Amino acid sequence: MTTFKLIINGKTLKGETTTEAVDAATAEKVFKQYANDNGIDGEWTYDDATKTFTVTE
């Protein structure tokens, strides 16, 4: 599977998290539910250099 990583540049949390998704098509569905729950609706960006969803709120 593709291990994606979501950064936490939000005003409620901070650090890093990982998961197990076949590709960004499923990684965002899991990372989005995580950020959407806490409240990280910053500006999402997917860095292809190392596959890592980067939001910032």
UniProtKB/Swiss-Prot annotation:
Sequence repeats, residue ranges: 3-57
Transmembrane segments: none
Top-level taxon in the UniProt lineage: Bacteria
Cellular compartment(s): Secreted, Cell wall
Name of the protein in question: Immunoglobulin G-binding protein G
Gene: spg
Part of the intact protein present: 302 to 357 of 593
